[model samples]
Target: SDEMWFCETLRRLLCPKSCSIEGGCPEVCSHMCPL
Candidate 1:
């Protein structure tokens, strides 16, 4: 599922706010990924 991951990551990169949660973001806004 590398392709899906890549696309998802790309989308997140474009709009980092979409990846944000009510509690808190896993990574900094610049990273655009949750850990």
Candidate 2:
């Protein structure tokens, strides 16, 4: 999702929270950062 930097969907509701384990979505992706 680095291309967009957003969760982009709700199907992965846990994606952001799930990703926090490390964390995947807008929160986990952009919030955490790909770099």
Candidate 3:
């Protein structure tokens, strides 16, 4: 979803490190973000 992209973008901007899995983000990211 676009939200996921937005969330990841913010995360990278703040941390400078991206959360990248072997391929990509899982189907769900509920527990990943602080929101």
Candidate 4:
């Protein structure tokens, strides 16, 4: 569940402008994936 946890954490950490309602989730996931 670590990936899920990280996803949830990023969901709260990313900026609204970068993470929107459209494709924000995927975009943010890509960015955080390298971390």
Candidate closest to the true structure, highest TM-score: 3
Please write out the lDDT profile of model 3 over residues 1-35, one tens digit for every residue.
88878886765555435335343544344344677
Instruction: Give me the candidate number with maximum lDDT.
Output: 4
Which ranges in model 3 have alpha carbons more than 4 Å from their true place?
A: 18-32
Residues 1-35 of candidate 2 have per-residue lDDT tens digits of: 53544443432453554654653345444433333
Candidate 4 regions with alpha-carbon error over 4 angstroms? 15-35
TM-score of model number 3:
0.41
> At residue 12, what lDDT does model 1 achieve?
66
Ranking of candidates on TM-score, top first:
3, 1, 4, 2
lDDT comparing candidate 2 with the true structure: 0.43
The true-versus-predicted C-alpha distance at residue 8 of model 4, in Å, is: 0.8
All candidates: TM-score: 0.38, 0.17, 0.41, 0.32
Show the lowest summed lDDT stretch of 10 residues, model 2: 5-14
What TM-score does model 2 achieve against the real structure? 0.17
- Model 4 agreement with the true structure over 1-35: per-residue lDDT tens digits: 77777766765676353455655445545666454
Q: Cα lDDT of all candidates, in order?
A: 0.54, 0.43, 0.55, 0.58
Which clashing pairs does model 4 show? none
Per-residue lDDT for 1-35 in model 1, tens only? 77768755765666554445553444455454343
